[PDB]
RNA sequence: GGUGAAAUUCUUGGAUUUAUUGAAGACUAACUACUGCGAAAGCAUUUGCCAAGGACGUUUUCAUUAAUCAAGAACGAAAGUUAGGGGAUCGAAGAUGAUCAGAUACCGUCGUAGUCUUAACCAUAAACUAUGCCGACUAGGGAUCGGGUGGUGUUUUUCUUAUGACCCACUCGGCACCUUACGAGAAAUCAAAGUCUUUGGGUUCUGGGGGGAGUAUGGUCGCAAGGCUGAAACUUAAAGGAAUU
C-alpha cells in the first residue's frame, strides 16, 4: 500500500490580519479532505509562529516572534487571528549581560473585548555617558518602584480597545517608548522590552471580529 | 515567491534528528533520523552521519516542492546538556550546500528557570 | 597549608550558599568554585558563513549568536580544558588572560 | 562522483600518531571556498588534490 | 610622619574629618532662621529637623526631613543665625 | 585509613553490645 | 536509549520526535559579582501584609545603665526517627545489563524509603574565615555596598530650578582586596596572626608525645538512632607542622 503523504495532503496558504503590512505569510500543508475528518474542523487549534520583519518588511523588528492561531477556514485558504507576541531567545540573551540589573515586570490583564492576557516586561539599567563606576546596578526599592510604574502603564494601555489596537501598538514598539519616557525620571533604563505576550481565555468563536481584521 | 518550511534540528550529544515540519509544526514533511543513515553506533553523534541525513531530507523535500527553510536548532537541555552538540552545524551546512534557501536560523533549546534535580547524584558522573 | 587566602572561592560575608550541577560530570558544586567560562559563539562555523550568504532568502540578515554560561566545575574543569594549573608563585593574578 | 581542489596553505600537522596533514583546500572550480581538509602524506602549496569526499570536514585528529 | 601639630589643625583637614573625630568635638550642623513667603518674621528651624515643621500660625510645611539634612520646601531665604 | 569509616564501625559495635546487654537482661 | 565502546529496557501499540493544551509536584536559571542580609545555620518568582533589624543622620533623651560569661536557655544544614498529606524528579537498599581475575564498586537501566510539607523530635558537620569576643592604636592605595554631607560638577528639559540616576571631593559603617615590613611569624603566610623577652587592655573557653580513644565504665538528655560528659591498663620513639633538594 502507498503511504506517501503528498497525494493525501492539501497545500493551504496563510493570511495574516490587516494589522500586518504583508497579506500572505506562508504555505501550510495539512491534509487532503477525505469524508469524515475534513480539513476544516481538523484545523482551528493550530498556531503558526512567524517573525515581524517579514510581516512588515522592516528589519528593525528582526527580533521577536508572533504566534497566529487559525480562526477562519475558507475554500483553499486559511485566515488567522493573533495569539502570542513572543520574543526571540537569542536577542533576550544578548540583552542579558553581566553587571546590569534585569527588571522583570509581569502583569495579568483583561481585554475590553473579553480576553485574558499576560504581559511581561524585561528592563535593564544602562551605563550612561560619563560613568566611571564599572558596575551598573540599581537599588532594589528603585527596582520595585520601576515595576510598579510598568504595571500602572500596562493597566493604562490595556482595558482600552480590543486586541487589534494592542497588536498595532506593539508592531512599531510605542509602548516601550512610552515606558522609557515615564521611567526616565526614576532610573535611566535601556532596552525596556515587552518580550512575551500570553493569551489565556477565549469565550466565544464570533465572526464580526474575525472579519474586521481582513480587507 | 518561495515555499517556507521549518527544519527543527535535534542534534543532541548522542543522536541527530532533521525533523522538517510545516509552519505551525503539526504536520511533518520528512524526518530521516540522523543515526539511521549509518548503522555504526559510534557514528551517530558524528557530523558525517548528520550531514548525510540532511542531504537525504533535502532530496525528499527540495525535489517535491519546498524550496525555502527556517532552521530551528535544539540539542536538548532542561536537565540534560543545554548546549549544541556535534551534528547540528554539519546538518545546517548540508542543508545550505544541497541547494535549499535559508529563512533565518534560530536556537530553541529548552532552558529552565531552575529545574528538577538532574541525574548524577551530588558527587556526579565518574569518568 | 592553605593554597589560597580565598581558601575555596568567594564565600566571604556569606557562607553555605546555593549549588549548581556541572556541564559534563553534572556534579553538585557551589556557585563560586563553579568556574564560568561563558561561551559566545555564532550558530555556524567561521568558514560556513559565506556559503550561507550565497544561498539564503534574507540577503544580508547577519548572524544569531548563542550565549551559554558554562558551569565547568573545578574537577572536570581540567582534562585538556580551561584554567590549567598555575605556579604557587603566579597564582595571585585575577586578570581574564 | 569526482571532485578536485588545489591546496594553497598548510594548517600544521595533527594526529595522535602524527604525520597526517591539516590543509586549506581551495577549489579550482569556484575559488570562493577554502575548506579545512585531512590529507595523508607529503603535500606542499599549489597541488591538485582529488577528493572522493564532497563536503565532510574535520580538524583535529585524536 | 615626623611632626604634625595635633592642636592647630588646618581649616581643610578638619573639614575632611567628621564631627567628633576632630580635636574639639563640635557639631557640623548650623541651625537656621527662616523667611517663608507668607509670614513677616523670623522662625528657627534645625538643619536636620527630624519631624514636620510649622512656621507660625498657619500650618505651612517648611522642611521635609529625608535622610541627613532637611528638604526645604519651594525656596526660602536663610542665614546661619 | 579513613576515620569516618572507623567511627561507623565503632558505632555498629556499640549497637551490637547494647543488643547483647538487652538480651542478657 | 545509552557511553570511552556496546549491551539491558521501549517499540507498526507508532514508539522517539513535531506541535498544541492539560495534570502534578518540587525548583526559581540567564541577571549573579571577590556583592547584600542575618546571631549563626542560612536565604534569590513578585506583591500583599505582619512584626523586627543594623547602618547612617541627630546642639534629642537617659546617665554608667557596661565587656565577657560555668550555670541554664533560644535557635541550629543534611541525613534519620514518629504520625498525617503529597508523591514529578533525582535517586541509600533492591533488582538488571555490562566492565572486570573477581563487581553485590565506579558506567548504563528501572525502582520502594527519602527529598517537599504540616505537627513533633533529634542537636550533630571540613556548623571553616580550621583565626573566641569586646576594645585601643600603629600603613599606603584604590574599588565597590549602605546612609549621609559639599559640589558656581555633567548630561539629563517640561523654559528653569527641585528631585532621582550620574562625576569629583570627602568622611561614617560593612564585606573584601592589592602593595610592602619598617613588625610578627617555625615557616607557608599576616594590616592582623602586628603593638609577644622591651613578655600583665579586659575577659570566657580549650590543649600538654602519638596510639589505645572519643573507645570501656558510669551518669544524664532522647520514641529510637545517637549526642553531652569522659578514663585507665597497656603500647611504642616517634606521630605531626611548614618549607627544601
Ligand atoms: Mg541517569
Ligand atoms: Mg554577614
Ligand atoms: Mg506550577
Ligand atoms: Mg531569579
Ligand atoms: Mg544585590
Ligand atoms: Mg529534612
Ligand atoms: Mg554484574
Ligand atoms: Mg547497587
Ligand atoms: Mg548508579
Ligand atoms: Mg520512571
Ligand atoms: Mg563539634
Ligand atoms: Mg572547630
Ligand atoms: Mg543641571
Ligand atoms: Mg540615593
Ligand atoms: Mg596523650
Ligand atoms: Mg557510654
Ligand atoms: Mg614526620
Ligand atoms: Zn565539572
Ligand atoms: Zn505662608
Swiss-Prot record, chain A:
- What Gene Ontology cellular component terms go with this record? cytosolic small ribosomal subunit
Q: Which organism is the protein's source? A: Kluyveromyces lactis (strain ATCC 8585 / CBS 2359 / DSM 70799 / NBRC 1267 / NRRL Y-1140 / WM37) (Yeast)
Q: List the molecular function annotations (GO) for this entry.
A: structural constituent of ribosome
Q: What is this protein called?
A: Small ribosomal subunit protein eS1
Q: Give start-end of the signal peptide.
A: none
Protein family according to the UniProt entry: Belongs to the eukaryotic ribosomal protein eS1 family.
The stretch of the full-length protein covered here is: 19 to 233 of 255
* Location of this chain's protein in the cell: Cytoplasm
Complex formation: Component of the small ribosomal subunit. Mature ribosomes consist of a small (40S) and a large (60S) subunit. The 40S subunit contains about 33 different proteins and 1 molecule of RNA (18S). The 60S subunit contains about 49 different proteins and 3 molecules of RNA (25S, 5.8S and 5S).
Predominant subcellular localization, coarse grouping: cytoplasm
Q: Which UniProt keywords apply?
A: Acetylation, Cytoplasm, Ribonucleoprotein, Ribosomal protein
From Swiss-Prot, chain B:
Per UniProt, the ranges with Basic residues bias are 118-127
What GO CC annotations are associated with the protein? ribonucleoprotein complex; ribosome
Where do the segments described as Disordered lie?
106-127
Which PROSITE patterns does the annotation name? RIBOSOMAL_S11 (PS00054)
Q: Please list the GO biological process terms of this entry.
A: translation
Is the keyword Ribosomal protein assigned to this protein? yes
Q: Which InterPro entries match?
A: Ribosomal_uS11, Ribosomal_uS11_CS, Ribosomal_uS11_sf
Q: Indicate yes or no for the key word Protein biosynthesis.
A: no
Which keywords does this Swiss-Prot/TrEMBL entry list?
Ribonucleoprotein, Ribosomal protein
One Pfam entry for this protein is Ribosomal_S11
Q: Can you provide one Gene Ontology molecular function annotated for this UniProt record? A: structural constituent of ribosome
Q: Family per UniProt?
A: Belongs to the universal ribosomal protein uS11 family.
Q: What NCBIfam families does the record tag this protein with? A: PRK09607.1
What is the recorded name of this protein? Small ribosomal subunit protein uS11
Q: Which organism is it from?
A: Kluyveromyces lactis (strain ATCC 8585 / CBS 2359 / DSM 70799 / NBRC 1267 / NRRL Y-1140 / WM37)
Question: What gene makes this protein?
Answer: RPS14
UniProtKB/Swiss-Prot annotation, chain D:
A cellular component term from Gene Ontology for this protein is: cytosolic small ribosomal subunit
Q: What keywords sit in the KW lines?
A: Ribonucleoprotein, Ribosomal protein
Xref: Gene3D superfamilies: Nucleic acid-binding proteins (2.40.50.140)
For this UniProt entry, the molecular function terms from Gene Ontology, in alphabetical order, are: structural constituent of ribosome
Source domain of life: Eukaryota
- Output the GO biological process annotations, alphabetical, semicolon-separated: maturation of SSU-rRNA; ribosomal small subunit assembly; translation
> Pfam families of this UniProt entry?
Ribosomal_S28e
Looking up PANTHER family in the UniProt record yields:
40S RIBOSOMAL PROTEIN S28, SMALL RIBOSOMAL SUBUNIT PROTEIN ES28
Family of this protein: Belongs to the eukaryotic ribosomal protein eS28 family.
- Please report the name of this protein according to its UniProt entry: Small ribosomal subunit protein eS28
From Swiss-Prot, chain F:
Assembly, in brief, is: Component of the small ribosomal subunit (SSU). Mature yeast ribosomes consist of a small (40S) and a large (60S) subunit. The 40S small subunit contains 1 molecule of ribosomal RNA (18S rRNA) and 33 different proteins (encoded by 57 genes). The large 60S subunit contains 3 rRNA molecules (25S, 5.8S and 5S rRNA) and 46 different proteins (encoded by 81 genes).
Keyword Repeat in record: no
- Which Gene Ontology terms cover its molecular function? structural constituent of ribosome
Query: In its keyword annotation, does this UniProt entry include Ribosomal protein?
Result: yes
Q: Which GO terms describe its biological process?
A: cytoplasmic translation
What is the name of the protein in this document? Small ribosomal subunit protein eS32A
Alphabetical UniProt keywords: Cytoplasm, Ribonucleoprotein, Ribosomal protein
Role this protein plays: Component of the ribosome, a large ribonucleoprotein complex responsible for the synthesis of proteins in the cell. The small ribosomal subunit (SSU) binds messenger RNAs (mRNAs) and translates the encoded message by selecting cognate aminoacyl-transfer RNA (tRNA) molecules. The large subunit (LSU) contains the ribosomal catalytic site termed the peptidyl transferase center (PTC), which catalyzes the formation of peptide bonds, thereby polymerizing the amino acids delivered by tRNAs into a polypeptide chain.
Q: In the UniProt entry for this protein, what further remark is given in the free-text comments?
A: Present with 11900 molecules/cell in log phase SD medium.
Localization, per the record, is:
Cytoplasm
Q: What is its main location?
A: cytoplasm
Q: Which organism is this entry from?
A: Saccharomyces cerevisiae (strain ATCC 204508 / S288c) (Baker's yeast)
Read off the Pfam families from this record. Ribosomal_L41
Q: Lineage in the entry?
A: Eukaryota, Fungi, Dikarya, Ascomycota, Saccharomycotina
Amino acid at each position: 500500500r502507498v503511504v506517501d503523504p503528498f497525494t493525501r495532503k492539501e497545500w493551504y496558504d496563510i493570511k495574516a490580519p490587516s494589522t500586518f503590512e504583508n497579506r500572505n505569510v506562508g504555505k501550510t500543508l495539512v491534509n487532503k479532505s477525505v469524508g469524515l475528518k475534513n480539513a476544516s474542523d481538523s484545523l482551528k487549534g493550530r498556531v503558526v509562529e512567524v517573525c515581524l520583519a517579514d510581516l512588515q518588511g522592516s528589519e528593525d523588528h528582526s527580533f521577536r516572534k508572533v504566534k497566529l492561531r487559525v480562526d477562519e477556514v475558507q475554500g483553499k485558504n486559511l485566515l488567522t487571528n493573533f495569539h502570542g507576541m513572543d520574543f526571540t531567545t537569542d536577542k533576550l540573551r544578548s540583552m542579558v549581560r553581566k553587571w546590569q540589573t534585569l527588571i522583570e515586570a509581569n502583569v495579568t490583564v483583561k481585554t475590553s473585548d473579553d480576553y485574558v492576557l499576560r504581559i511581561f516586561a524585561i528592563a535593564f539599567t544602562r551605563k550612561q555617558a560619563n560613568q566611571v563606576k564599572r558596575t551598573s546596578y540599581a537599588q532594589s526599592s528603585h527596582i520595585r518602584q520601576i515595576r510598579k510604574v510598568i504595571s500602572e502603564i500596562l493597566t493604562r494601555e490595556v482595558q482600552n480597545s480590543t486586541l487589534a489596537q494592542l497588536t498595532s501598538k506593539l508592531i512599531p514598539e510605542v509602548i516601550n517608548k512610552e515606558i522609557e519616557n515615564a521611567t526616565k525620571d526614576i532610573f535611566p533604563l535601556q532596552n525596556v522590552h515587552i518580550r512575551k505576550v500570553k493569551l489565556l481565555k477565549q469565550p466565544k468563536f464570533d465572526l464580526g471580529s474575525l472579519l474586521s481584521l481582513h480587507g | 515567491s518561495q515555499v517556507f518550511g521549518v527544519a527543527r534540528i535535534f542534534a543532541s550529544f548522542n543522536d541527530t534528528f532533521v525533523h522538517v515540519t510545516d509552519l505551525s509544526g503539526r504536520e511533518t514533511i520528512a524526518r530521516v533520523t540522523g543515526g539511521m543513515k549509518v548503522k555504526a553506533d559510534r557514528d551517530e553523534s558524528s557530523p558525517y552521519a548528520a550531514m548525510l541525513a540532511a542531504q537525504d531530507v533535502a532530496a525528499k523535500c527540495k525535489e517535491v516542492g519546498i524550496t525555502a527553510v527556517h532552521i530551528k536548532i535544539r540539542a536538548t537541555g532542561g536537565t540534560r546538556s543545554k548546549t549544541p552538540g556535534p551534528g547540528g552545524q554539519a546538518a545546517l551546512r548540508a542543508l545550505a550546500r544541497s541547494g535549499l534557501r535559508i529563512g533565518r536560523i534560530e536556537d530553541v533549546t529548552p532552558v529552565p528557570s531552575d529545574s528538577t534535580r538532574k541525574k548524577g547524584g551530588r558527587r556526579g558522573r565518574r569518568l | 597549608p592553605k593554597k589560597r587566602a580565598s581558601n575555596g572561592r568567594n564565600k566571604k560575608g556569606r557562607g553555605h550558599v546555593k549549588p549548581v550541577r556541572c556541564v559534563n560530570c553534572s556534579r553538585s558544586v557551589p556557585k563560586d568554585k563553579a568556574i564560568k567560562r561563558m561561551a559566545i559563539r555564532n550558530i555556524v562555523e567561521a568558514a560556513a558563513i559565506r556559503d550561507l550568504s550565497e544561498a539564503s532568502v534574507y540577503a544580508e540578515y547577519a548572524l544569531p549568536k548563542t550565549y551559554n554560561k558554562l558551569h565547568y566545575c573545578i574537577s572536570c574543569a581540567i582534562h585538556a580544558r580551561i584554567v590549567r594549573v598555575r605556579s604557587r608563585t603566579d597564582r595571585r593574578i585575577r586578570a581574564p588572560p | 562522483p569526482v571532485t578536485l581542489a588545489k591546496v594553497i596553505k598548510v594548517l600544521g600537522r595533527t594526529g595522535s600518531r602524527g604525520g597526517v596533514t591539516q590543509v586549506r583546500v581551495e577549489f579550482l572550480e569556484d575559488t570562493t571556498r577554502t575548506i579545512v581538509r585531512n590529507v595523508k602524506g607529503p603535500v606542499r602549496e599549489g597541488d591538485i588534490l582529488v577528493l572522493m569526499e564532497s563536503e565532510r570536514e574535520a580538524r583535529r585528529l585524536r | 610622619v615626623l611632626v604634625q601639630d595635633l592642636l592647630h589643625p588646618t581649616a581643610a583637614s578638619e573639614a575632611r574629618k567628621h564631627k567628633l573625630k576632630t580635636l574639639v568635638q563640635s557639631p557640623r550642623s548650623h541651625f537656621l532662621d527662616v523667611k517663608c513667603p507668607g509670614c513677616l518674621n523670623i522662625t528657627t528651624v534645625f538643619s536636620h529637623a527630624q519631624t514636620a515643621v510649622t512656621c507660625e500660625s498657619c500650618s505651612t510645611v517648611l522642611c521635609t526631613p529625608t535622610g541627613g539634612k532637611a528638604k526645604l520646601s519651594e525656596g526660602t531665604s536663610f542665614r546661619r543665625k | 585509613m579513613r576515620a569516618k569509616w572507623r567511627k561507623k564501625r565503632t558505632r555498629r559495635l556499640k549497637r551490637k553490645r547494647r543488643k547483647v546487654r538487652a538480651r542478657s537482661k
